[PDB]
Ligand binder design. Structure first.
Ligand SMILES: CNc1nc2cc3c(=O)[nH]c(N)nc3c(CCN)c2[nH]1
Ligand SMILES: CNc1nc2cc3c(=O)[nH]c(N)nc3c(CCN)c2[nH]1
Ligand SMILES: [Zn+2]
Ligand SMILES: [Zn+2]
Lengths: 368, 368
């Protein structure tokens, strides 16, 4: 395969379906990336992640630089070998996570923070992602808190665009990385159209393999997120993938694809699965509720996953109530399979020209 | 298959190897039973338990009567259907576990205890094990604390023998149970030869499908446990299986087989795996130790398990240090596979008449 090739096979309105070909594999789009923040998709073996349909997983610069360490992982052969996932990996650049989880000192050079003193900069971020062996490298950005005033959003976006250029140059200076990995830029500008335009224009001038919509799913709500996507995605190059960072719930995914997004990542299926929340086509359910204690049905009536072929709601209820690890395993496998099935149904419906009908059917049932 | 048939295929000294045939499957002996106290072998799917080589697992009357409840499990189709294990299940009778984990009131009728008020008696125990759908039912006993005076051990053993008769009669009165399940009696008498003889004689007079050595691995130490087995196992009927309850470490298993034991159960491989302890043929290792942080070798150099085929000590070190669920999963799978491999090597070496050499080789290396 090539280092990177995105091909759009079919379209419906703003929605697209296609493939990204990379050296370690093919990614079907629209794609959902399970999140593997500490070099594991929590409670799943990599073979189980792949069995559910995933083509690519997400890793995090921030968590892995802290534990077990980027240099350590490189000495051990890179992240793919370390965790036993041989397919593409996208790594976030840090910076969302620094601001989210760290003590911190921000400057034009980057950010210094407390987990032991650490530092991130465009150059260091790109180098960490190299040491991990990431296939899709994210530019190092600033994720603008919500709400933001226009002045603060603009200052923040402009810094991010200067860091996007530094990210580009750092990646390109590293031949092995430039020849084997891809680089995505991240659009900022909060909820403001003009700032989003300026950011899109800056990123396209630099040129990236893919373009993320950053700065959303940070407190604004679905209506606002959708309003911003409505004008923001069309600003990005049409022939490159569009990645909505940190989204989201099933209905957020459907709506975002209707607005031109091709890639997603979210901890919701893994995290909330461990907490007892199971996704179903009739909406989410909380398996800990007493109403499931003697329910012999599978978590979801249609789901093809191994969990729903073999175990009842009653059993999984028992396991989660008891805090058994197998409860976390089964819930997480089902929720990640559900998300992959949603992405398959989206892909197939766009390929067949019936995605708008699918989105309406989906919503009427999910919210019934 | 028949309800129950034990056949001895080969012998070496006091050691035996053979099969127990039951309706739900064949059990190869000497056998190790992974423990599934809350209707799960912790952190493993039943298919993974079977892939490691297990033929039979252990369930507990005490835990399951509390959560999710014996009547509940019967209404849901029994324990095999509930947890997805279709092969034989042995259930302990409660009583070790009551004394261990419960508030309690003991009388000749049974025991009343605090988890909500609960009660166990020979009759109730056997009925719970029926409701669970156990294949091998344990008589309801009293596990004599260690150390015990001869008087207290004798009183306790005599009560247990009266409860063994009540257990027999309760099981036999229940036709479906008597026709499809097996019943094992449990020898008591602490460390005293004469009391062990009396107990063996009482149990054989009643007659059981198998005979457990109860009252050991409760603080006496390996030398003493082995001293007691030396005289106690020969007292039991030679043509029925001999089950050493709650044992144990790999070397305890080897020594006990040398003394005529055919079946074992222990939480050590599961529990200590979750705590970072991995079994290897060169002895146990604690994977959390810093010396493994960059060790690319598998947990054990010879082990055939899927964990050792795919992941390094360094990765598992990271996962356990981080408290990741996949760490518990991988450690537990390896430790249960190690135990099954030990039992296979024991079986094969007795079949080939070279078990005494195996036991010596094993020990020289394990303790090197
Ligand atoms: C859950 N919401 C959320 N919004 C994001 C925005 C950014 C963002 O604007 N930049 C970066 N680098 N990452 C983001 C992430 C993390 C993706 N796993 C976000 N997550
Ligand atoms: C770890 N040591 C230990 N000693 C046991 C003795 C009895 C015993 O004497 N009786 C019964 N019913 N169970 C025992 C158990 C529980 C087996 N999982 C014991 N476990
Ligand atoms: Zn499912
Ligand atoms: Zn292994």
């Amino acid at each position: 395969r090539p280092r990177f090739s995105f091909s759009i096979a079919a379209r419906e309105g703003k929605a697209r379906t296609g493939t990204i070909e990379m050296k370690r594999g093919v990614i079907r789009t629209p794609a959902f990336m399970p999140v593997g923040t500490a070099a594991t998709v929590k409670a799943l073996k990599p073979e189980t992640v792949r069995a559910t349909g995933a083509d690519i997983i997400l890793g995090n610069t921030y968590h892995l630089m802290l534990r077990p360490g980027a240099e350590r992982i490189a000495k051990l052969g890179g992240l793919h070998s370390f965790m036993g996932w041989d397919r593409p990996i996208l790594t976030d650049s840090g910076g969302y996570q620094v601001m989210s989880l760290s003590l911190t000192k921000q400057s034009e050079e980057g950010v210094t923070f407390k987990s032991s003193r650490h530092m991130l900069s465009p150059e260091r971020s790109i180098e960490i992602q190299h040491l991990l062996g990431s296939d899709i490298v994210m530019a190092f950005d600033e994720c603008t808190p919500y709400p933001a005033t226009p002045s603060r959003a603009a200052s923040s976006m402009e810094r991010s665009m200067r860091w996007a250029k530094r990210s580009r140059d750092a990646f390109d200076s590293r031949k092995e990385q430039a020849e084997n990995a891809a680089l995505f830029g991240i659009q900022q500008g909060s909820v403001f159209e003009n700032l989003r335009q300026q950011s899109a224009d800056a990123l396209a001038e630099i040129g990236f393999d893919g373009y993320a919509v950053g700065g959303l799913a940070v407190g604004e709500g679905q209506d606002e997120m959708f309003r911003v996507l409505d004008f923001s995605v069309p600003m990005l190059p049409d022939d490159k993938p569009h990645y909505l960072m940190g989204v989201g719930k099933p209905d957020d995914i459907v709506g975002a694809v209707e607005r031109g997004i091709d890639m997603f990542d979210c901890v919701l299926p893994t995290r909330s699965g461990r907490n007892g929340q199971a996704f179903t086509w009739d909406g989410p359910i909380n398996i800990r509720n007493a109403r499931f204690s003697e329910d012999l049905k599978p978590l979801d009536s249609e789901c093809h996953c191994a969990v729903c072929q073999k175990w009842s709601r009653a059993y999984i209820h028992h396991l989660i109530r008891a805090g058994e690890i197998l409860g976390a395993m089964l819930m997480t496998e089902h929720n990640i399979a559900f998300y992959q099935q949603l992405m398959q149904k989206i892909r197939d419906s766009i390929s067949e020209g019936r995605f708008s009908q699918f989105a309406q059917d989906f919503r009427a049932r999910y919210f019934a």
